[PDB]
Structures are given as C-alpha cells and as structure tokens.
RNA sequence: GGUUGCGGCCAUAUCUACCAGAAAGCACCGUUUCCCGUCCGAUCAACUGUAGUUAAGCUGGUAAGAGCCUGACCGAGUAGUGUAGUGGGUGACCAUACGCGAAACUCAGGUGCUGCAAUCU
RNA sequence: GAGAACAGAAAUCUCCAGUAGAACAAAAGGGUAAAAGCCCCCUUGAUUUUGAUUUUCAGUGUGAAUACAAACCAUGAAAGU
RNA sequence: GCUCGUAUCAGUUUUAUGAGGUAAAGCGAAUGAUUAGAGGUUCCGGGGUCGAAAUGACCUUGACCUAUUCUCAAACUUUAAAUAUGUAAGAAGUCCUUGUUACUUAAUUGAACGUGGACAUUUGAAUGAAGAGCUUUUAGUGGGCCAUUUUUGGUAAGCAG
C-alpha cells in the first residue's frame, strides 16, 4: 500500500492566498547581536548625548 | 666575448650505496668522513624493492657535497686513479659529469681493516658565475641560453684544463 | 540514503574559478565596510572559515554589524509564505560591495545637483527618470541610399 | 622537439602575481600585515619596510590603498654619510642609524617628535617605546622584511632597533638582537651595544691589523685614506646620531639637472618599436627573399 | 555509390536522405575553393587527409614546408 | 624616459628563440673575527663597495611565434530557449506567430597600464 | 630526459624540464605552491564563562559552527593566527 | 475584531547592479572515450633479405611530435544562454556644526547616535492599489488525481516517481 511521497504542487497557491508580503521595518532597529564592546561605547555615548543635550535645552 | 663565462667547479658529490644498513654504512660513512674531511649525510630509501633487499627508510647510502679546493684536489685524484680517461658518454648533456671508481685506497686512504674496501661515485656539477642568480631567494631566475652549460662546451674544458683526453665514441 | 549537507550541491556554485586559484588579491581586505551599507555575497572556495551557505550565495543584504575579520549581513529569506529576517557572520573576501547602491548614491547626488540648478533659475529639471518613450518623427534620406532590394533565397543543400 | 611547450598547457598555465614571478613579495605575509581590523574602519596600518642590497639600505614607512601603496617617510643609507657615517653603508650600525632616521624624520613629519624623543643615552637594553600619561600614543608601525630571513643578529633587527630607540613604537621581542643567547635566555646589552656603535667591525679592524696586514691594507681602504680606528669609528657612529637628532628634516636636493633633459636621453639611447606595416614590410621582405627566390 | 547507400538505407532504420556532397571529397572546402588552392599551393597531400597552408605562424616553418606556394 | 623600494589591477604582464642596453640602481668577489646556519659561507648570516665584465639576473626590441586580451552588420539572427494555436505529422520531430538570444569557427588589432617615495646624463 | 663502479626497467647521488598532472587518515566533490603538501622548532586554543548566529527547521530539539565579548595561554621578531 | 484616511504595498514591468553552470556548444582546449592515416622509427621488444662482426639498411609493434582526422560524455569542460532569481530606485533621504563616548586612532583621527540649518504639487522610474497594517481564536484537511511543457525507472502501460 504505497503512497505518494512528497510533492511541491499547491504550495506557491497557498502561500500567495495571504503570503508573501514582505516583513515590517523599523527605525532603531536591536542592537543584538552586535558586539558588546560597540555596545558599552554606544550606551556611555548615548548617556553622554542625553546629558548634553538637557545641559542645551534646560 | 667571455668576461665571466669561464667554467669553475660548482661542487663535488662523493656518493656510496650500501645494498644493506648497519655495520657496513656506519664504517663506510666513517671512511668517506676521513677521505672528505667533513661529516657525510645519510640517504634512507625511498621506497621497498624485495631483489635488493631494502625497505623504506633504511639509511641505504651515504654522501657528502665538496667544494672549492679541496673539491678540485679530490677530483685530481680521481682523474688520477682512472687514468684520465672519460666518456663522451660518461658526460652529462647538461655540463655537468663524474664516474665512479672502486677501492678507494687507491686515492691514497690509508687501509684500515675494519672499513676493508669500498667503491663511490664522484659527480662534479659545474657552472659559472649566476648559481646566486638561479638559486637565491629573493627573484629567482634562469640563467640564459649563452651563459647555459653543455656537453661540447664541458668536454673542451675538460680537455683544455688538465689536458686530460677523451676517447672518441 | 539522501543527502542534505551544508556544502551539499555546491560542487560547481564553490569551485573556484579557471585560472583565476590560489591567493586572494588584497582590494578584498583593503574595502571598508560600516553598518547600513549593501553588499553582495559570493562566497571564495578558496576561503573555508566565514563562508557562507549555498542559500546566501548571489544573495545581497545589508551589513549590521563589524568585526574584526568580519561583517554582519542582514537578508530577508522566504521560508513558507513569509521572509525572516537571517543574520550572517561573513568573511570581507565572501563579501563585496554594491554598484546598484553606488550607482543610486551618485545619482542622488546629482539630482541634488539639478534641484539646486532650478532652484538658482528654474528651468524645468524634471528631477525623475522616464521611460523609452516612442521614437519620434524622422526623416531619412535616400541619396547615397538608394534601396537594395531583397528576396528570399531558394533552398540549397550546402553540404 | 622534445622541447617545446603544449598550447593547451599555455593556455591553461595561470600566471602567478606579477611580484611573486618577479620574486619581491610574499603576498601571504602581506595580507597579514595589511588586512586591518574592520572595526577601524579607515585606520592606517603603517608598515616599517626596510630593504638590503650591498650598497644601500632602504626604510619606509608605508601605509597600503587600493590604489596602492603610499609612502610616508623615508630613510636611505647613500644619505646617511650627508649625517656622517661614509663607510659600511650597508652594515649593522648603518641600519640602526637608518632606522633612527627615519624615526625621527615621521616623527618630525608627523608632530611626535618633542613627545617620544626615544633614548638618548642609548646603552643597548631592551625596551619599547611605552605611552605618556595625558598625552598621544606613540606611532605604531611593523615590521616588514619581505623575504629577507629572520634570524638572531640580522641588520633588518638592527634598523627594527633603531627606529625602536629612535622612538617609533615598533612591537618587537629581544631573541633575535645579536648578544641573544639560546642557552640562556638573556640578551647581552654590552654585545648589543658594541653591535650598534659597530663593536665587530672595530674588532675585525684590529685583528686585521695585528695578524694579517695584507687583507688590512687591500680593502678597509677608505678608513685607512680618511684615518679611522677602531676609537675613532665609535665616535663618528655617535656623531651621526647626535646629528640625526639634530637635523632628521630630510632636506632634499634640486637634482643638479631636470627630469625633461633626463627623459630627452633615455629616450634618444632607447630602443624603439616597430609599427605594423613595418612588420608587414619585413615579411614582404622576408618571403621575397627566403621564399621567392628573390 | 549512389546504389550502395541505397542499400545502405534499406538496411537502416528511420528515414535517410542521399546527398551529392559539393566539397571535395572528404575536405570541407567546394570544389572551386580546392580545385583554386591546389593550382595555388596552400593544399597539399598527407597520406590521406591534406594539410593546409596559414596566413599566420612562423613563416620559416612554412617555408621549409609549403615550398609550392612560396616558389611558385 | 631609465632604475630601485613598496605596490594596485593579476599573462596586453606568461612561454620559446635571437639581438641591444650610455649613466645611475641587485652582482663573482676580498672575505669568514664577530651574529647565524648548513654534509658543503651552494642557500642563509655577517664585515669591506676596494683590483676588476654587461656576465647576464634585470629592462627593452625583434618573430606572417605559441599563448593571452580586445572587437566585428564573419560565423549567425544560426544552435538553443519563454509564450500560442482544435498548427503539420502514425510518430520521431518540424514549421509559423509574439520575443530573448549562444559557443565553436573566420577575420582585424594589441603584446602591460598605473599609484607613492627615492634616484639617474 | 641526461649522467655517475657494482647498479640492471626499479637501490643512492647531480643537473634540466616540470600549473600540480603529487600529497593533504578515510568515500566523493570542492580547496591549497615562499602552501593547506614535505621537513624542522616550540606547543596544548582539543582551556573557562555564558550569550548571538547558520544549516534540516515548526524557524522546536539533537548533530556539526560562523562571527564576536570577557579571561587565561600557545606561537611568531611582528603583523597576526 | 483592533490601531489607523489615498499608508513601510505588489505572483507585474523598466533602469541599474549581482549570482548561476542547465540548454546549447567544445574535444587540431584539460579529464575520460574513440576512427584512420602520414611523417620522422634506433632508450629493450617480432620475423624476412645483405645473411660470421654492435647504434652498418628497410618493412611492423609504433619507449614517441603533427598540417593532422571521424565521432562522443547524467555523475567532463574553456565558453555559455532563454526562462526563473537577489537587491536598489530616497524624507528612517542628501549636504556644513563633530556635541557625547569608558569603542577606535599617532592625533578632535574614525565609528555609532544626535542638536542646530538648506531641499514642494515631477519627495527623485512604470502600472495598479478593490482601504494599509496588526492581534486573538477555532473548523475541516493532512488517500489525491488529470492536461501542456521539463524529466526519472521501465520495451511499454489508462504504469511508478
């Protein structure tokens, strides 16, 4: 009692029905992954921003 | 036209290749040692051959590389143990010769017993000035066509210096 | 048994090049490569560390992250009826910059460059790109082009 | 023919890089030394090349573009006697007085030289040229030898040690200065000091002098014609590098003549190439003589 | 020859056609083209094929060869 | 324009044969006391550039050169290929319509360009 | 390919040619020539911590791992690895 | 259902820029297969005629170059399509102030983020958009079959894949 195997017919259909749009951007997007050491610098940089940027527009 | 083209001994190998290992080699290494004035090298197998009776990597011979003086003084005894009698055939096609010859007490060793008698080959590679230029590190090169070695060329110098002849065929 | 590797199928895709083996030139190491920018994967053969897969292979992205040696590559892969967003830690010699993203930043640049041309005296830029619109009306001569006739040949067996 | 190459092989041969074929460069220690890390996106990395021929000794300072590379200072023993070393210019104590040049010249060039004055009571102990507190890093270059061989008392060593007392901030172990010993792992500051303020030759001098005057007197010509001992060539070494301290500025010369009138006479003594209807001339010639039958 | 292929084609399978070659033989030049060469010397006979003469290479090598074409 | 050092593109740069090279810029050497390494100062290391050749590494030039690059309304709109027909044909396959479009062949040209620094009748 | 007494088709030595036609544990395919092959020297990074990532994937797990980070080391003159 | 009015879009094209080794083609280009000569064969091999002397002669196998020549390759290839396929076509953008940093640089050198300023009905191709986007929850399904093309095993099958 064989049976059919495996078959790529009606995929690409079901797909496209609600598919393929592609995926939503952002600006800012996560910083994971990146490396730490880039990470430290731009969080003591942002901090630093931040401060500075209060001390302008008290 | 011959400024630097003039032939010189490049080196002198004095070559032996005991079918077996052990006593034989260490005493024949010894007695090549004693004629050379320097200590030999150890050549093992390259491969196993069941006639000869080897096996790989079994130190089968040993020889050593002479140059300058003391080259040219043992090559004077060689050609004087046989008779100043070469080959065309005995030369290379590429100026480089040699021969091999048998008993070495006849280049004047004096006989130990304990080595007994033992046959080697000399070869003399020769050139002329640019063996820096063809094997030195930094741009390697070829020397060229003129300056290249050759039979005809070899066996006139072989001729001209030490006025040694050669046979015909 | 089948056979999925990660180098599976990938005989002629990884095969190096016909005469073009052994050494990288060094333009590969000397590119400089920062976070946004749009970069080409093909991966080296010749390269067995960093390499990419045979998916990311003639795929471009968009670097994320730098490292010592490396460059992270953002791609958008379909898996199903969705892109996922994959995240690659390429070598420089797999990667290699975009002339599309080149080309584009030149010609921003020079639109930039007309736009402040009409704004000094307005002469109609049309900043954007047009099509190949229909060839217009010409006229072409006939003296010294005097129509040659042609006819179809008949069938010959040229054997 | 047994001499005579395939046109598939020709076809098929792939030519190596044209400095590899030439025999310059090793592109494998090249890559190392110039791929920089990707995280500094633009920084230089500065490479203190020095070459050896038997009569000159060359030290740069290059940094590497895509275009090529691009050289920042340089050093050069045939102007070494302008800052008063005249023989030997192409020994030990010539290269550390080389590399002492062309560490003060970037350091002048580049506005490091108040800062990181090196040593000036040079003794031949090992150091390197450390940071100052509250102020720049020292300029970070490598060594570059190309195929030149790395071995314990070579004069790429000692021009690597001058730049390095000089005051260019060149990584670098002390295994290699001659006076290293392998036995004991420590280096003799008095055998390297004699080594750069040229110990050896000032011994071969007098040894020469006290055994065999024959190869005394037929070469070390020039210190014989200009009356140079073995006291008198450690103080010249040292006024050479005083005056190098003094003036590294590189003062150039106007070449005594111009680059057109130098063009006029290559070109006049050069060989010229054959156009194309020449060629077709000559084997008109050639097929009407060889061929024709004239 | 003609009767030959004929039976040739009896034995053969599918569909075969039987076509007066304009080439000389079994070379790849007309009869004009081969027939002018070899009143002209850029033909000439090995054992069975022919060699042919040119434009490029090494005239001496043709010269020592192809001695018609030059003296003639 | 020659040359050197560092190179970028990596044969228009390679390979075979031959001829030429003023002046500068590696040479056999004098050498092995020292550093260093080998059976062998041949390679590598080192000190003198001093008696000395263009040897010839190197460069340039020449071959109806091989190769390698660049083109073509040469091959050839051919092989192949996407789309269409209730097109042909027993079929194998083929033609047409709307498009895309090779390679091998055949000719023609070329035989390194260039960046930084230094130096040279 | 040429040459050297035994030594010859195959023993060791020496030149010349040699785009790899060799070798790289294995099966095949890639890759590698001042090396990724052969030899020599040192050595344990086949170490610790827990993250991110690729591949089959449901973007689950197992198997390998690409890039880092914080340490401690190896090697090299050093760049680096 | 939720947040939102001509939207961060698209089973499409164009322009620009990547990747491919399939069709084709090629084998006087590499590997493997394969037909036929001819030329020179003297570094071992076979017999015949000069016939008691070796590299003193010829015909063969051919220790072997061509002007070579006929055919080929799913697990061969220099070359190499068509159809498919990855990106980009900007306001989350482009240019002066480097303001912050414990990262980085020899260095206020770079890296990232940002404050001040300039850019309108061609805000940077075409076409369309029937409202973009987003979340929860759950049914049935998880035996498929048949054209036209590509294609595997098989003689073939209303065969199997």
Sequence with gaps: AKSKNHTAHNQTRKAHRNGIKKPKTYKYPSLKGVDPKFRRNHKHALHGTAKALAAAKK | ?169 | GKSHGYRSRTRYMFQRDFRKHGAVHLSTYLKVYKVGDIVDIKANGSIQKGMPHKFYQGKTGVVYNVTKSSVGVIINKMVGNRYLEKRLNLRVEHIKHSKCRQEFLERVKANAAKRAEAKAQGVAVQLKRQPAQPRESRIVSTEGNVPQTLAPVPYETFI | ?294 | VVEGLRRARYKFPGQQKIILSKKWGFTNLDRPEYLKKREAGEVKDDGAFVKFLSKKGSLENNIREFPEYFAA
């Design chain 4, 1 to 294: 023919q047994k001499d005579a190459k395939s046109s598939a092989y020709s076809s098929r041969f792939q030519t190596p890089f044209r400095r590899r074929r030439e025999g310059k460069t090793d592109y494998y220690q090249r890559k190392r030394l110039v791929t920089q890390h990707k995280a500094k996106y633009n920084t230089p990395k500065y490479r203190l090349v020095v070459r050896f021929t038997n009569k000159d000794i060359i030290c740069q300072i290059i940094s590497s573009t895509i275009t090529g590379d691009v050289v920042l200072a340089a050093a050069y023993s045939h102007e070494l006697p302008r800052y008063g070393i005249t023989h030997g210019l192409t020994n030990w104590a010539a290269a550390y007085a080389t590399g002492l040049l062309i560490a003060r010249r970037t350091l002048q060039k580049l506005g490091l030289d108040e800062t990181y004055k090196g040593v000036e009571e040079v003794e031949g102990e090992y150091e390197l040229t450390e940071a100052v507190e509250d102020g720049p890093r020292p300029f970070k270059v490598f060594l570059d030898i190309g195929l030149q061989r790395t071995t314990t008392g070579a004069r790429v060593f000692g021009a690597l040690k001058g730049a390095s007392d000089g005051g260019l901030y060149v990584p670098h172990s002390e295994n290699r200065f001659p006076g290293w010993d392998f036995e004991t792992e420590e280096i003799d500051p008095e055998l390297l000091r004699s080594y750069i303020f040229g110990g050896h030759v000032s011994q071969y001098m007098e040894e020469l002098a006290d055994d065999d005057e024959e190869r005394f007197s037929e070469l070390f010509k020039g210190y014989l014609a200009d009356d140079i001992d073995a006291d008198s060539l450690e103080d010249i070494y040292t006024s050479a590098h005083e005056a190098i301290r003094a003036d590294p500025a590189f003062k150039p010369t106007e070449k005594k003549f111009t680059k057109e009138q130098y063009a006029a006479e290559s070109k006049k003594y050069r060989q010229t190439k054959l156009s194309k209807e020449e060629r077709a001339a000559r084997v008109a010639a050639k097929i009407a003589a060889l061929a024709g039958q004239q």
């Design chain 2, 1 to 169: 036209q011959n400024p630097m083209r003039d032939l010189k001994i490049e080196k002198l190998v004095l070559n032996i290749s005991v079918g077996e290992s052990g006593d034989r080699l260490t005493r024949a290494s010894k007695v090549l040692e004693q004629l050379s004035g320097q200590t030999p090298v150890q050549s093992k197998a390259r491969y196993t051959v069941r006639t000869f009776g080897i096996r790989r990597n079994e130190k089968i011979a040993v020889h050593v590389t002479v140059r300058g003086p003391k080259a040219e003084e043992i090559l004077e005894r060689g050609l004087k143990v046989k008779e100043y009698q070469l080959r065309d055939r005995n030369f290379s096609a590429t100026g480089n010769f040699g021969f091999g010859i048998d008993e070495h007490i006849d280049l004047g060793i004096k006989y130990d017993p304990s080595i007994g008698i033992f046959g080697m080959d000399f070869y003399v590679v020769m050139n002329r000035p640019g063996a820096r230029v063809t094997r030195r590190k930094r741009c390697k090169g070829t020397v060229g066509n003129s300056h290249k070695t050759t039979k005809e060329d070899t066996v006139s110098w072989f001729k001209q210096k030490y006025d040694a002849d050669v046979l015909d065929k």
